[PDB]
Each structure stands twice: as C-alpha cells, then as structure tokens.
Amino acid sequence: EIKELLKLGDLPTSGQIRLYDGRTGEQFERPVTVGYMYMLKLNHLVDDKM
Amino acid sequence: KPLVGTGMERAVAVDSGVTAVAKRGGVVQYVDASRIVIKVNEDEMYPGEAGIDIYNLTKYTRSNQNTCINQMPCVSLGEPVERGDVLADGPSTDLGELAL
Amino acid sequence: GSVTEFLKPRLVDIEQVSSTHAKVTLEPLERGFGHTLGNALRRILLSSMPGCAVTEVEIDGVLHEYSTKEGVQEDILEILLNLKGLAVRVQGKDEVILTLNKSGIGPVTAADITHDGDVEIVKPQHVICHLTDENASISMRIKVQRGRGYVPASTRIHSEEDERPIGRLLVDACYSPVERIAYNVEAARVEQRTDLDKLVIEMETNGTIDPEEAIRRAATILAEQLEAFVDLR
Amino acid sequence: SVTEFLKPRLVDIEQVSSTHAKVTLEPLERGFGHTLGNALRRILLSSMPGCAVTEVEIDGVLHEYSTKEGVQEDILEILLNLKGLAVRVQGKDEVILTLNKSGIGPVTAADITHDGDVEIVKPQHVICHLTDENASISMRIKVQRGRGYVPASTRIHSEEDERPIGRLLVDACYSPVERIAYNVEAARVEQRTDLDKLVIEMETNGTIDPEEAIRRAATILAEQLEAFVDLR
Amino acid sequence: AVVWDILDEVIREHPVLLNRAPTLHRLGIQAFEPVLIEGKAIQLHPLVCA
Amino acid sequence: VLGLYYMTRDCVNAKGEGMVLTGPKEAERLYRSGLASLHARVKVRITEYE
C-alpha cells in the first residue's frame, strides 16, 4: 500500500531519490532515502546544562 | 498535526484537561483570544436557563516545568458546534489532535 | 582551433510563470561551465540577495508580546509570526514606517496597510489578523528596513541602544527574498555546435525582487570576488 | 553596508617547490569559501588549455601488446612516460617531433629532435631506458593544443580507422595542473566568527607557476562572466 | 574587546583535561589543547570520542 | 570505516575501466572530473619505499 500511495504521488517506487551536493554541485552516485520525520525537542537544552 | 499518526491521538487530546470541550452542542456567538461565547441550541439547553455558555481560556500560565501553557481558539464566528467538540487548542494540540 | 575562445553567455530569454515563480535562460555556455556556473549562481543567490523585511512593531494598548488585545481573534505572538512572512517592496529608502489601522469586524490582511509611494505589498491578500467586534479596533506601526542575511533579535539588540520604549516589539528578520533556486543544463543547437549547452534557472521568491536584477547583482559580486583573486601578486 | 561584502586579502603563499604551492586567503563571507573552491577546482581541472602529446607511432611497434627489444620497458611503460612529458609550443597549434637514438642508457627528452618553437620543461625526464646499444629507438610523436583532459577511449572509435597501422593513442592531459586541493576553515576577525579562510594546495608541471595558473583561471572565469557585469 | 583578545592570547598553548563519568580505564581522561569556538557545547575529535 | 570500505571495493564494469594511469595525482584528477568510477580495475604505476 505504501508503494501504491507513492505511485499516486508521481514519486519513485523504490523510495530513493537522486540528490545533488550543495557545496560541490555534484550528483551523488547512489539514490538516497528522502522522506518526512516527526521531530521533537527533548527539554534538555544545553544552555541550562553547561 | 504529525503526518503519520495512530488514531489514538484524538482520544488522548479529548481526555486531557488542556483542551476546552463543548459541554453542550450549539452555535458560537462570539470568539476572542481570551474567551468563547457559545449560544446553545434550543433543544439542547437545560430548561429555564440563560442558554449562553462562556469559556475562559488561560493565557500564558506557568507549567510545573517552567513551560508556557497557552490555549488558542480553533473556530470562527457562527460555526455550529456539537456536543463534545474541541474548541481551544492547548499546548501541543492541533484541531483536537495531539501534536508534539 | 580557437582553443582560447569561449562564447559569452547571454540572458537569451526570461519567462514569468508567476510573480513568485520565474525562469531565466542563459546561452551559450562552454562544456562543463554549465554545472559550475549553475552551482555558483545558486549558492550566491541563496546567500546574499538584499531584501527589505520587518524589524519593529509597536501596538497601542499592549506592552509585551505575551498579552491579549481585546476583540482580536489571534494573539500577539501569532500576529508577529504572520507579519514575519509579509514581503514589502521598497524602491529608494533604507527605512520606512507603515501605519495600519482597522476598525470593526473583519479579517485584516496586508491589503489594508496605509501605503507610501516608495513601498508596496506584493501579496495584499496576506492575512494578518481578524477583528471580531465593531467597536474593537487595532492600530499598529511597523518599521521596515533594508538588510541582507538573517539577523536574530539578540544580535541587533547587541547594539544596546539606550532606553528602548517598553511598548516596542522586535521581530527577527530574514532579508533573503528568494525561497528556492534550481538549475538545469540542456544541450542546444547554436552556431552549428554540439559542445554548447544552455542553462535554465528556475527561481521562486516572494516576488519582491526582479529575476534579472538579482542575476546581475549576483554576477557583479561574484565578479568582484574573482577580480580580487586576479590581483594576487 | 548591504552593498559591501568582506573582500579578502592575498594574505600569503608559500611555494613548497618550483611546482608546489599553498595559497591561503582570508577572511571570506559565509558560503563563499566552498563556492570559490569548487569553481576554481572545476575550471582548472576541465578548462585550462594547453598542448600535450596525443598520438605516437613507432617503427618497430604495431600495438600496445607488441614488443621491441633492447629496452626492458614494454609499450605501456614508455607510453606512460610520454604521458608524463612537459611541453610548450609557441604559435603553432600542432607539431610532430621525432625521437631517435642508439645506445645503452636512459633515453631522456634531450634526444628528441629539437624544434625551436617547441620547449621541453624538464629534459632530465626519462622517456625510455635502452638496455643495449646495438638496438635503437625511432619513433614519431605529435603534440597538439587542447583544453583540459580527454581519455583515449573518447577518441577510440571505428570511424577513426584512418589511423594507420602502428599508430598509438595517448590521453591528452592538456591541463598543466597536476593536483588541486581546495580547503575551507573557520576564522575570526573583530569577533566575527563565521569568516572563512580558504587554503589552496596546487601542484603543476613546470609549464607555468601555480600563481599564474590561478590568475589565468580567475581571468577566464571573470571574462566568461563579464556579460552580466553591469559596471566597470 | 580587549577581554577577548587577552583570552585568545592566554590560552594559545595551555592543555586542559577532559573527563567523562564513569572513568573506566586510563583513557577516560585525556589532555587537549583548547580552541575557542562560539557556542555552548564542547567539540571533540571523532577518534577520541570512539 | 564505511567510506574506506566503499572506496576500496571494485566493480566488474565501471566508467573508464581498463585505463592505465601515471600516478595517484592522475587518479585524483580523473575521478574529480567524473570520467571514471572509484571501482574501475586499472593499472597504475605506483612508487614505494622500504
């Protein structure tokens, strides 16, 4: 179902996209996994630790 | 709202105390970043009552961990509201959905 | 033959998909130059395009951002965050002051700010807040200045200008007008040559900056750096 | 002001040799370090023009898998030596030279049939090593001017059957640059921490000094860019 | 500003000791020349961290 | 270790495979131009000391 849903979005079925390094302006040699992640802040702010 | 969920976020959002929930279905008479004024529906109002409910939203209190606790309205004027609906999005809450 | 000869690229065409989305075209290019110049232009454009942003906001009836103005659907912090995304085009001034007043119920958008001849709004439909009462009214005064980069609040308050009035609110700025730059290289047919290639630049911005003008400014700064390099003894 | 950017100063260069150089410059605005480093690296490695050995023919040799006695090295080794041959030609876009000698010892660049318009930077370089005097080396080598680098396989084709028997193909390392290593580092000036110090390691054949190569590349890039320059 | 200049001058060659709890073996504490860096976290070389 | 193992492997068929280079300088130049993969099986004249 994930494969089908990706296929609906006109995105590669393999789930790996080509990428270009910004600093080099060069394409990578391997398709890379690019997606979306839900990130959280963990209350351990360094400014209160150091 | 997180893109990928589990379906229980609605339940935990409802059963938390942060989110204001409409005790009686009705129509919102008035909105404000401080309070919400709901005009309860006639069939739903308790008989012999003013028929207007007021909800006060706590604004920038202090958590037990020194975190801000701000609740924001999530509706506009005149929107119909049913019984048990979510009105004030509390911290980490989005349209009655948990969002950390 | 002509081993030292390199054709000079030109802005062969410019197309305007949208006030936000545009595409420019460079031709001709020597082989390999395409990727190099594309990467360079992308980096420079993302880096150092001047833009006018919002710096200071003063609102009557309030003292600090964590307070509520009566009859306003949104709170002050949300208003500031909305104001962050506003894009204002200035023409001849480094600073400008904008006074916006509104009264009565209604969604107050960017279309309502009292304009000045040297400033304008690219997206007047950019909503700001919502009054929800006829007697309730909101009057605000904003300062828009010209800068480059992305200045956090603490850096600018490090100027330590004495006696800042309490009823003054500071919001950090991101002067960069552009939002996404991509480039592509396509083999073309020019001068009956095969080595030549054509560069296509797609760029989406807030629209406050002309595409060609941005290209010229970036080329100018890059050329300045290169000339500084040439000066090496 | 907004219009101004922190242009660097040519703070130092140290020539590790007549061919090795370390050019360090600073300070630089953010992101400029890698941008300039990548641009200069690509330009030097794929666009600097020059002249180099391209095609080789030998009387006693028909192919790379062929053999010629009197020399311990086979075809491939001497081809590599020819690849490692500094050369500069003035005016002429192409010229053919002849190598011929008989005797035991290192056949160096001095034995090449000299041409006034053609100069070999390092005659001490060893082309071959003849193991006997009764045998002799005789061959012809053509040098043309080109840009950057190109492998033989690029020129290897069936359309090029016009190349006669015993004609060998050599990769054309036109670019005088041997090695280029750009590097970025942090630096602080007047409490501005995000200032970039750029360090270039350059290694070149004796055709030109590294600094001249850098200036050549910079001039080429600027001239190519000059179309969009709106001022003086 | 002179404060920062003096701080730069003082620490040019002055080892400091870095330690992590628990100190299992003798490599748990090591000396390092410090380089002043803006921020609030200690930067480390990867090999020493491993 | 990941990068080193990646760089030390070899493929049967790679870009610019089968060429013969002078020295490591030429190897770096050839790869940076992208004219050949890291995995090409090639002959190189290498020097060493003992």
Swiss-Prot record, chain A:
List N6-acetyllysine occurrences by residue: K7
* PTM entry text: Acetylated on several lysine residues in the presence of glucose.
Tell me what this protein is used for: Co-administration of salinamide and rifampicin or salinamide and myxopyronin suppresses the emergence of resistance to both antibiotics.
Superkingdom: Bacteria
Q: What family is reported?
A: Belongs to the RNA polymerase beta chain family.
Known partners and oligomeric status? The RNAP catalytic core consists of 2 alpha, 1 beta, 1 beta' and 1 omega subunit. When a sigma factor is associated with the core the holoenzyme is formed, which can initiate transcription. The rRNA transcription and antitermination complex (rrnTAC) consists of RNAP, NusA, NusB, NusE (rpsJ), NusG, SubB, ribosomal protein S4, DNA and precursor rRNA; S4 is more flexible than other subunits. In pull-down experiments interacts with CedA. (Microbial infection) Interacts (via flap domain) with Escherichia phage lambda antitermination protein Q; this interaction renders bacterial RNAP resistant to transcription pausing and allows it to read through termination signals.
Q: Please describe what this protein does.
A: DNA-dependent RNA polymerase (RNAP) catalyzes the transcription of DNA into RNA using the four ribonucleoside triphosphates as substrates. Resistance to the antibiotics salinamide A, salinamide B, rifampicin, streptolydigin, CBR703, myxopyronin, and lipiarmycin can result from mutations in this protein.
What gene does this protein come from?
rpoB
Swiss-Prot record, chain D:
Q: How does it assemble?
A: Homodimer. The RNAP catalytic core consists of 2 alpha, 1 beta, 1 beta' and 1 omega subunit. When a sigma factor is associated with the core the holoenzyme is formed, which can initiate transcription. Both the N- and C-terminus interact with different regions of transcriptional regulator CRP. The rRNA transcription and antitermination complex (rrnTAC) consists of RNAP, NusA, NusB, NusE (rpsJ), NusG, SubB, ribosomal protein S4, DNA and precursor rRNA; S4 is more flexible than other subunits.
What's the record's remark on domains?
The N-terminal domain is essential for RNAP assembly and basal transcription, whereas the C-terminal domain is involved in interaction with transcriptional regulators (such as CRP) and with upstream promoter elements.
Sorted keywords for this record are:
Acetylation, ADP-ribosylation, DNA-directed RNA polymerase, Nucleotidyltransferase, Transcription, Transferase
What do the Gene Ontology cellular component annotations say? cytoplasm; cytosol; cytosolic DNA-directed RNA polymerase complex; membrane; transcription elongation factor complex
The protein in question is named: DNA-directed RNA polymerase subunit alpha
A single GO molecular-function term is: protein dimerization activity
Look up what happens after changing R42C.
In rpoA112; temperature-sensitive, blocks RNA polymerase assembly
In residue numbers, the region (Alpha N-terminal domain (alpha-NTD)) covers 1-232
Protein family (similarity comment): Belongs to the RNA polymerase alpha chain family.
Keyword Nucleotidyltransferase in the entry? The reply is yes
Q: Give the Enzyme Commission number.
A: 2.7.7.6
Note the residue range shown relative to the complete protein.
Answer: 4 to 235 of 329
The top EC class is transferase
Q: Where is this region: Required for interaction with Crp at class II promoters?
A: 159-162
Q: Name one GO biological process term.
A: DNA-templated transcription initiation
Curated annotation (Swiss-Prot), chain E:
Range of the intact protein held here: 406 to 455 of 1407
Describe the task this protein carries out. DNA-dependent RNA polymerase (RNAP) catalyzes the transcription of DNA into RNA using the four ribonucleoside triphosphates as substrates.
Q: Which family does it belong to?
A: Belongs to the RNA polymerase beta' chain family.
Practical applications according to UniProt = Co-administration of salinamide and rifampicin or salinamide and myxopyronin suppresses the emergence of resistance to both antibiotics.
Assembly and interactions? The RNAP catalytic core consists of 2 alpha, 1 beta, 1 beta' and 1 omega subunit. When a sigma factor is associated with the core the holoenzyme is formed, which can initiate transcription. The rRNA transcription and antitermination complex (rrnTAC) consists of RNAP, NusA, NusB, NusE (rpsJ), NusG, SubB, ribosomal protein S4, DNA and precursor rRNA; S4 is more flexible than other subunits.
What is the protein named?
DNA-directed RNA polymerase subunit beta'
* PTM: Acetylated on several lysine residues in the presence of glucose.
Q: Specify the superkingdom.
A: Bacteria
Curated annotation (Swiss-Prot), chain F:
Disulfide-linked positions = none
Posttranslational modification? Acetylated on several lysine residues in the presence of glucose.
Application of this enzyme or protein: Co-administration of salinamide and rifampicin or salinamide and myxopyronin suppresses the emergence of resistance to both antibiotics.
Give the protein's biological function: DNA-dependent RNA polymerase (RNAP) catalyzes the transcription of DNA into RNA using the four ribonucleoside triphosphates as substrates.
State the family named in the UniProt similarity comment for this chain: Belongs to the RNA polymerase beta' chain family.
Question: Subunit notes for this chain?
Answer: The RNAP catalytic core consists of 2 alpha, 1 beta, 1 beta' and 1 omega subunit. When a sigma factor is associated with the core the holoenzyme is formed, which can initiate transcription. The rRNA transcription and antitermination complex (rrnTAC) consists of RNAP, NusA, NusB, NusE (rpsJ), NusG, SubB, ribosomal protein S4, DNA and precursor rRNA; S4 is more flexible than other subunits.
The name this protein goes by in its record: DNA-directed RNA polymerase subunit beta'
Origin organism is Escherichia coli (strain K12)
